[PDB]
Amino acid sequence: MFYPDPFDVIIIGGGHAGTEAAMAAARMGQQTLLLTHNIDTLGQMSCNPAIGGIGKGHLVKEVDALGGLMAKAIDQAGIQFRILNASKGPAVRATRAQADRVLYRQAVRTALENQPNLMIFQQAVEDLIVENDRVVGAVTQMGLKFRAKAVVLTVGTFLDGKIHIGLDNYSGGRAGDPPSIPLSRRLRELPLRVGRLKTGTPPRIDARTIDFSVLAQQHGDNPMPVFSFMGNASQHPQQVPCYITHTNEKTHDVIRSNLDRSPMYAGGPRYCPSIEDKVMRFADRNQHQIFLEPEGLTSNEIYPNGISTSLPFDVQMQIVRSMQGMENAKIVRPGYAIEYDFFDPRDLKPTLESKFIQGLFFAGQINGTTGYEEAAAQGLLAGLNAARLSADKEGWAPARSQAYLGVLVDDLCTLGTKEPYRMFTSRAEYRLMLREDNADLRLTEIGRELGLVDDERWARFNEKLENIERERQRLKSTWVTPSAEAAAEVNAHLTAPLSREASGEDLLRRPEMTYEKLTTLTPFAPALTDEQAAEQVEIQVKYEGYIARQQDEIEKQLRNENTLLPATLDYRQVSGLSNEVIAKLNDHKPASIGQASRISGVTPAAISILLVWLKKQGMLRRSA
Amino acid sequence: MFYPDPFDVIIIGGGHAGTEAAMAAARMGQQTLLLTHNIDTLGQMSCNPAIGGIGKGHLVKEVDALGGLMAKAIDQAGIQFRILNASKGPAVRATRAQADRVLYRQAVRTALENQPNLMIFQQAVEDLIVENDRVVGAVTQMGLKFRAKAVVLTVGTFLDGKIHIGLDNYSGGRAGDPPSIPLSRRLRELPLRVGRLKTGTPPRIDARTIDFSVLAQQHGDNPMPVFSFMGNASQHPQQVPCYITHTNEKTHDVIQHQIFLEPEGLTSNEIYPNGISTSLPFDVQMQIVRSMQGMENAKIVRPGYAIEYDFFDPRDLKPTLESKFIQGLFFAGQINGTTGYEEAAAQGLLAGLNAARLSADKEGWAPARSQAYLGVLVDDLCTLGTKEPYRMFTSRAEYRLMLREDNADLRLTEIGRELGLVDDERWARFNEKLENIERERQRLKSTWVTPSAEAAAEVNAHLTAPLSREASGEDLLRRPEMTYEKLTTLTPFAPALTDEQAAEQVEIQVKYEG
Amino acid sequence: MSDNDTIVAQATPPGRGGVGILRISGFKAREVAETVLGKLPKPRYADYLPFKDADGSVLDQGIALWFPGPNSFTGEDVLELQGHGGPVILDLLLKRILTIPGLRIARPGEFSERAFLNDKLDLAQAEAIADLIDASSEQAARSALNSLQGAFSARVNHLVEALTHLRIYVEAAIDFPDEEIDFLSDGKIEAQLNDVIADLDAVRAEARQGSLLREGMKVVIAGRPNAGKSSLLNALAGREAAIVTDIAGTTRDVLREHIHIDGMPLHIIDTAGLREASDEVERIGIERAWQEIEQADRVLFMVDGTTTDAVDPAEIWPEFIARLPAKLPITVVRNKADITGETLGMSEVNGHALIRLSARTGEGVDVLRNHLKQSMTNMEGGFLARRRHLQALEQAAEHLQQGKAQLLGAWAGELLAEELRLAQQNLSEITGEFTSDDLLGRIFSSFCIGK
Amino acid sequence: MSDNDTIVAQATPPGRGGVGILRISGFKAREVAETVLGKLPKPRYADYLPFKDADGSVLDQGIALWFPGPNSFTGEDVLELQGHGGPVILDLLLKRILTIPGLRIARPGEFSERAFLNDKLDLAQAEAIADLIDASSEQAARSALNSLQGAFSARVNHLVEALTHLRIYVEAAIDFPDEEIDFLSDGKIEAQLNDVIADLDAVRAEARQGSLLREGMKVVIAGRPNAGKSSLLNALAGREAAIVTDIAGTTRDVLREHIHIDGMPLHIIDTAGLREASDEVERIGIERAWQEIEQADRVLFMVDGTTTDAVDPAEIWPEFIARLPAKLPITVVRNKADITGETLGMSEVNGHALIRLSARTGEGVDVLRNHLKQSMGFDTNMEGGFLARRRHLQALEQAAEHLQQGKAQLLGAWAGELLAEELRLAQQNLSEITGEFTSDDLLGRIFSSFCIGK
C-alpha cells in the first residue's frame, strides 16, 4: 500500500500546467513526484495547434523568464512565425507561431524525462487524504498510496467531462481519452463549490482533397523571431504557408435551415464562439473568413480555423462542401464539444492555495480559464509555492504591477463573472511597463533568489544588464552645440536645428528620430552589437515620463497591498457596514484591503470603516 | 444517418492486422475505409519492441514478397540486427531486430496515410448492419452509420477486457485505452464459440537508476542484414548495444538466468527487462527488480500488469478467413486467438486480399503449405480449429530447404502480380534477379575442365581427391569444401555475378538440387 | 491617494453664519499655507491676515491658525482658516484651494479617520466613529442627485457615451487585429476625437446658466385638496403664494418657496391636493408631487381636524404611509383646530408628533417652527456637492488635451488608449464605475469577433 | 442692548459640524472665563484646554481664545471659545454661560453694533457685513466684499469734504456782503458746484449699476393660453419648471423662478393665458398676472407664428396694448417658428424687438438669452464697482435735489444764505449714509435685520 519514500510535492496530472509545476518544483531542489494518466501524451495539443498571440505571448515570455519549458518546446516544433502589431508601439506587439505537433510532443517529453530530483509515474488518482484541514497523501487506482507534504491538482478538463455532438453525448475527457469520474465526486464532497462549463472544436480535413490551386496563401516572416531569451533562428524547422478561404450564402442558408438540431437556440459567453452564432447574431453579413492550416510537416491533416460549431454531422459535411476549393472534401475527425467541472476561484489564496484546506493547490483549467498559456503560468506559480511551503519558507505571489500573472490571479479571484477567462492586453492597467522584451529584466532575478534560474541564464542576464547600464551611461556623456563642427548634418536631417547646448540623451527625446539613426554618426558612435539590449535604451528613453508616473502611482497603494485580511474574519462583527456590503465581503473573503477595494460594490466609506475597525481590534500593526 | 457515398471494403480497427488489411485492399484497386479509436496510436507495440526471430522472421519476408508494409518500416525503425544460427544451413537461419517505438510508429502512420483509394475515419464503432445474413455497413458510437459491401473484423484484445495488477484488476482494452464493450455483445446473437486468454508485461525501469559500468554489452552482426528484398543497409538508424544482467537466488526465494536490458528507443530513458514478466503486485515487483546486479536502487516508471480478453476460435471461418456463418464478414487478428505482430500482419493481408476480391466480385486465393509459411500458419490454425494460439517455428515446415526465408520472393511475388498486390518497380527488380540467376546457372553448367588444365595443380591442391576425369563448374562447386568465392577466384570460371543475392541463390540451388 | 494626501474640507455646517472654517491636514499643508497667505505665521497663534488670490485681490479677511504635527487634531500638518460664513465666498475660496496640484477634496468623515489612526483621538468611541462616517457618506451620496438632476444631467450622458464609442473603436484594433471589423484606425479617428472635446465644453457651459442652487434642507407639505395646503404655505412664507379657496384641486402645479429659520435654511414645497385625478393636468400634477415626495427630507402629512379625529398617520392614510420611504421622518399636523377647537400644542403619536393648529388664523404656528429647528443635516449641501462634479470633469479635459497632442507625432495607439482610459476613469466619478470588463463586453456585443 | 451688560451669542450656522464656536463679549468675559475655565490663557494663543462646568465636571474639549480689548473684533474683552460642532453640548454650555448673572443673549447686530459704536469703521460698512454673508451670485458676492473693503466710504468722505470746503467758501463770502456779490460772480463757486455735481452724478450712476445684481430685474411672459410661455420659461430655467401640455389654461398660479443668464441675476415671471374663463381661480390668476406686469422692468410677447402673421402689436391683440401702460419696453417672440419655418433671429416691429424661436426644440433660446442680457443696462466692461442700497439711492437723490436747488437759487435769486443752507442740508443728507447725523432709530432698525449673533 504505502510507498516507502516520502516526496516533497506531488503533482496530479501532467498536462500543460502539471509539467511546469513539476519542472519548477524539481529545479528548486525538492523531491517531486508526477502522477499522470498516460505517457506519450505529455505535450498534446487538443485544440488549435498554435502558440502565443495577444495576451498569451506575454505569459509565455514570463514562463520562459522564470525558467520554464513552454518557450523552449516551440522553437523546435513551430512551422510558422509571425509578429502581431509590428507597426504599432513595442509595448503592444506579440508573437504567434503555428507549431508542428509531433515535434512539440517529443521535445516536451524528452525535456521532462531527464530532470534531476523529479520522478514520473503512470497511474490514475481516485481520492485524497486529509485530517484536521490538512492534505497528506493521494490514492491511486491499483491500491498503492503516496505520502507527501504538498499536493497540486492539474486535472484540466478531465473532471467528469462529457462529449456532446448534436443532441447526443457520451463520456470523454477529450477525443480519444477517458474520463476521471471518481475524483470528481471525491473533490465534490469537500467544502467546495463546483460548477460546469462547455466548449467545442471543429473537424479536421484531409489535405489531399482540397484544391489549393485556387486558394490564397499566407506566409510567415523574414528573419523570423524567437520566443526564449536563449535560443536563435537556427533551431526552427522548415516553414509552411496557410490557405485562406471564405463562406457563401448557401452555407448560411443550410445553417439557418438546420438550426433546429442544436442544444442551444432550438428551445453563453459575450462573443460568438461557433459559426451559427456568427450568422444569427449578425445576419446581414454575407461572408466570413476561414483559415486552413497544416497540423505538421509530416501529416496531411488540415485544421480549419473559424468554423467551429455544434450541429450534427450532416450539417458539418454540407458546410464543408459549400465553400470555394472544398467542393469534394473529406473529414477524418468530426467536430464536437465537451462539458467539464470547475471550481470558482473565490476560495483560494492569491498563491493558488485553497483558503480552507492546508497544502492543497489548484492550477490549470479547473481555475475557470481556457488556453494553453493560461495554464502554464498557473502551474509554475503553484509548483513554486508548493516547494516553498514543503521547505517551510514564506510563499510568494506577484503583484498587478510586475507580471501578467498577477493580473490573471487577481482578476480570477475578484471578478465574479461566468465567461471562461481569456487574457487580453487591455485587461491589465499597467501595459506600458508590463511589456515582453523586458520580462526577464523584471523577473529573472526573483527566480535566482528562489533558485529557479541556473547559471547560463544568470550569466546572460548579467551581461545584458552590464550592456544596458554601459549604454545608458555613455549616451548620458554626450553634448552638442548649434555651432558644432559636425552639427551641420545633425540640423540638416533633424527638424528644429540646434539653438543651444545639445545632448544625445536629449537628442533622442524627439519622436521622429530613432536609435539606429543616432548610432550611425561620428558622435553617438556605433551601437552595441547585441541589439536585443539596444532596444531597451530606446524603450526607456521614449517611455520615461509615463513609467515614472505609473511608478509613483504604484508606490502609493503599497500600504493597502500589505494590509492582510485573515480568512477567519467575520464581517458580521463590524459596526457601520451595510447589509449588502457585509454579504459581499463575506462571500468574497479578500486577502488585503486593496483587493477588497477592487471588488465591485464596495466604496471608500466601507474601507475606511473597515480600517477603523481593524485599529480597534489590534488586527493591524499599523496602516501607513 | 447514412454517409452520402458508399464504399467497397470496410476494415474495423487499425491495429497490426488492420493496417495490412487496409493497405492490401487499397492497393488492389478498391475503395476502403479504416475505422480506428485514435489516429495518434497507429503503429503501437504493446510488448517487447522486437520483430523477427525464429519463425517470426519468415512471415515478415513473405509479407514483403507480397508487397507489404511491416518490413519496410522495421528497416527504418530498427537499432540492432542479428542473424540467429548463422553457422547452420539456410533452412533454420533467421533474423531479428530491435525497434525504436517512436520511429516505427511514425513510419507506419506516414506510410499508411498516403495511400490512394484509402480513407481513415476516427470514430469507435458499436454495431454492424446485417440483413438476411448479409453484411452491409456498420454504425458508430456517435450515431452515424456507413454502408459497404464487405467487412473485415480485427477488433483485437479490447473486446471485454480487464487490466489486472497484483491482486486486483479493472476493465479496459489496455493500460489507458478504453475497450469496445457493446461491440462484443452485438456479435453474441449468432451461435458461436467463446474463449478467453490472459497476457501481461513486465515493468519499465528507469535508465538513470541502473549502473552501466558493471554490465556486459551485446552488439549485433556487423554487415547489417535487411528484411525487405527491395531495401538496403543505408536506411538503418544509429545502432546501439544491449546489456546482460544476471539474477540472484533471492529472486527465486521471493517468487542463474541471464537477463537482457533492451533499450526501448533511441531517444528515451526506459528499459525493457526481458524475463521478469509476472502477475505479482507492485511491492513484489519492486522487491524482484531490487534483486539483480546493477539494479540495487532503481525505480519503476510504468508498473507491469496482466490482462484478459475475449475471442472466437478460428474454427468458424473458411480457409479464406471469411465467416462461414455470415457472408461478407471476415476474421483476422487478435480476435482469432493469436498474439505477436508477424502472426497477425499476414492474416490481415490475406483477409484484405479476400475482402477486396469478393467486393470486386472475383475469387480469392488461400495460400498452400507447399508454397507459403503464412499459408502453413493459416492451415494449421483454421483446418485444425485448435484453440491453442499457433506460434511460428522452423520445425513445423518439413519442407525446410524450399520454404526458406531466402526465396520467398521467387515463390510468391510473381503470383502476387496476378492479383495485383505487386508493383512495377518490384516486378522489374524480380525479373532482373531471375534472369541473372538463370544466366549464371547456365554459364556454370556450360563450363568444363580436365586434369590436363594448367590450373589443375592448384585445383588438386585446394580439392580432396585430385582431378581424375572431365569436370564442370557446377560439379566442382558441389564438393563440400568448395566455395563460390574460391570458384570466382580462378583463371577459369570468369568473374561471377556481382549480384550477391543471385550468387547465394545459385549456390543454394546447386548444393541442394536434392 | 496615499494616506499622505493633503486634503481640503469645510468644518462649519452649511447655511448662514458669521464664521466659516476650512481646514487642511496633509504634507502640502505648508504648501497651501504659503500659497494662500504668502507666508507662514507664528505656530498656534491667532494671527490675522486677509485671503489673497493669484491676481492679488482679497477673497476674505479672518484668522489663520497653523498647527504643525503631532500636537493637532490629526497629528499632522494641519491648517485652519476662519472667515465669513458665505456660501458663495466659501465656494470661491475652495475653488482657489483645489487648483493646486496634488490636492483633493476630503471624503465623508475623513478627518475622523486621520485623527483616529494617528492615535490623536481616544479609542473608546469606535462604535460612534463607525456612524459619524456612514451618516456623512450617505448624506453626501443623497446629495449630488440634485447636482445632476436637470438638463445638466443630459450633456454628461452624451459625453460619456461618445467617449465610450471612441474607446470601443480605438481599443478594438489593438487587441483583435486579425478579424474583419474594418477599424477606424485611419486619421478619421482624430476627427471623431475632436467632437468629444467639443462636447465637453457644452457640459462645462451647461451648469454656467440656469437655476441658482439655493442650498438648504427640503420640506414638503401635502394632503387632500382643500385641506389647508395653500393656507399653511402662505402662513409659513409670510407672503401670499397660492390662491386660497374651497374649490377642490385649486392648485395644480408645484410651488417652491424659500425661508430661513435662525440661520438654518429650509425649502417649502407646495403640491396639489392628493386624490384621484380625472384630468390630465390633475394626474400629471399628482405624479409630480408624488415624485417630489420621495426626494424630500421632512414631511408634514395633512390631518384635517374637521374630517376626523384620527391621530395615527397609518390609520388616516395607510397606503400613503406604506408608500413612504422608511427613513423619511414624518410629522402630523391637525389642521383646522380653530373651528374644531382642539387644544393647540405639540403632541406625539406612535413616536411621531401630532400637532393641532389654526392655519386660518396662525394659531400654533410657532410650535411647528419650534419642532422644525429642534429636529436638527450634516454637510455636503449643494455648493460642495457640485464642486466634486465640476472637479472630476475638470481633470479630464486636460487628459484629452495631452492625449490628442500625441497624435501630432508618431501614431502610437497605446498612449492614446492610456490617456482615454485615464480620462474615462476621471469621468467615472460622476456617473458610475466603468471597469475594463464592461468595455470588453460592449466590444463583444458590437462586433462579430467570436472565434 | 446695554453695552455694560456682557453678552454671549453663537456664531457658526446651526446644525452639526466640526466646530461650533461661541462668541462672548462684555465686562464679565474674564469672570465668565474663570467660571468656565478657572484660568486666563495668554491672549491670542490657541490654547488646548478643557471646559469646566459649574459642578466641576468636564463639559467638553476644544480651542479657547482670549482676546482682551481693544485688539479684538469689538475692542472690548471678548472670549472666543471653540469646541465642537455638537449642537447638544452647545445648548448646555450656553445655558451655563447664561446662568451667571450679568450675561444675556445680545440682540442681532450687536456684534456689529458695538464695534460700530466704537467707530471701528464706517456705518454703511456694517450693512456691508451683511449682503455678503448671504448673497446670490459670485459677481454679487465679490462686489459686496469689495465694498466691505471700504471703497464707497472713500467716495462719500471725499464728496462730504468737498462740500465742506465749498460751504467754508460760501460762508466766507456771505460774512462780507460788500464783496459777497463779487465772490459769487467770480466763477470759482460755480465751477466747484458743477464739478461736485458731475462727481455726484457719476457716483449715483455707479450706484444704479450697483444693486442691479442684487435682484437684476423682473420679466413677465404674457400671452394667450397654450402659447408656450410655460415652455419658454422651462427652457430658460433648464429643468421641469412647469407643466406643459395641449390643454387650454395650462397654468393658473403665478410662477416665479430665480436664474442667472450670465453672471447676472433676474426674475422671470410666468402667467396664465389671457382669456375670459368662468373659472374663479383662473379669473384670480388673470388678476394676479395683470397686477405683476406694472412691477416688471421689461415685458415680452409670445404669439404662435402660424396663428397670425401680424407682427405689429395692435394686430396681434389690440386689447393688451391699450391696457398696458406705456414707457415699458416690450418684445414679441414668435413661438413655434419651426412649423412656420421663419428665419430665426432678432427683429424689430413698431420699434419693439420681435424674436422667433421654438420652445420644444430649443432653437432660438440662445438669442433670447443674449437679448435679455444686452437689453438691460449691464456689461462686464466695469468690474469691482460698488454695491448699493435703496436708502443709499434715496439719500443720493435728496443730495442731488439739494444741489440743484442751490445752484438754481444762486443763478436766479443770488441768495447766499439760501444757497449755504441748501448746501449744508445736502451735506448732511450725503453724510446720512456715514452715520454722523443719522439717528439711532435707523441704526437699530438696520442692525435688527441681521441674523442672531452677528
Residue numbers in the entry:
A (entry chain C): 1 to 267, 273 to 629
B (entry chain D): 1 to 255, 292 to 550
C (entry chain B): 1 to 376, 380 to 454
D (entry chain A): 1 to 454
How does the study describe this entry?
MnmE and MnmG form a conserved protein complex responsible for the addition of a 5-carboxymethylaminomethyl (cmnm) group onto the wobble uridine of several transfer RNAs (tRNAs). Within this complex, both proteins collaborate intensively to catalyze a tRNA modification reaction that involves glycine as a substrate in addition to three different cofactors, with FAD and NADH binding to MnmG and methylenetetrahydrofolate (5,10-CH2-THF) to MnmE. MnmE is a homodimeric protein of 50–55 kDa subunits, with each protomer composed of three discernable domains: an N-terminal domain required for constitutive dimerization and binding of 5,10-CH2-THF, a helical domain and a Ras-like GTPase domain (G domain) that is inserted in the helical domain. Within the MnmEG complex, MnmG is responsible for binding the cofactors FAD and NADH, and it is also the main driver for binding of the tRNA substrate.
In the α2β2 complex, the MnmE (α2) and MnmG (β2) dimers assemble alongside each other in an elongated heterotetramer leaving one MnmE and one MnmG subunit vacant on each side of the complex. In contrast to all previously solved crystal structures that show MnmE as a symmetric homodimer in an “open” conformation with the G domains of each subunit facing but not contacting each other, the GppNHp-bound MnmE dimer (α2) within the α2β2 complex adopts a “closed” conformation, where the two G domains contact each other. However, in the α2β2 complex the MnmE dimer shows very pronounced differences in conformation between the subunit that is located at the periphery of the α2β2 complex (A subunit) and the subunit contacting MnmG (B subunit). The large conformational changes in the B subunit of MnmE in the α2β2 complex go hand in hand with a displacement of the swivel helix toward the entrance tunnel that leads to the MnmG-bound FAD. However, while previous crystal structures of MnmG from E. coli (EcMnmG), Chlorobaculum tepidum (CtMnmG), and Aquifex aeolicus (AaMnmG) present MnmG as a symmetric homodimer, the subunits (C and D) of MnmG within the α2β2 complex are not identical, due to the structuring of flexible regions in subunit C upon interaction with MnmE. Interestingly, we also observe very clear density in the EM map corresponding to a bound FAD molecule in subunit C of the MnmG dimer, while no such density is present in subunit D. Closer inspection of the structure shows that MnmE binds with its α-helical domain on top of the deep FAD-binding pocket of MnmG, thereby partially closing off this pocket. Moreover, within the complex the side chain amino group of the C-terminal lysine residue (K454) of MnmE is located within interaction distance of the C(4)=O carbonyl group of the isoalloxazine moiety of FAD. Interestingly, the distance between the amine group of K454 and the reactive N5 atom of FAD is 5.8 Å, sufficient to allow the presence of a methylene group covalently attached to K454.
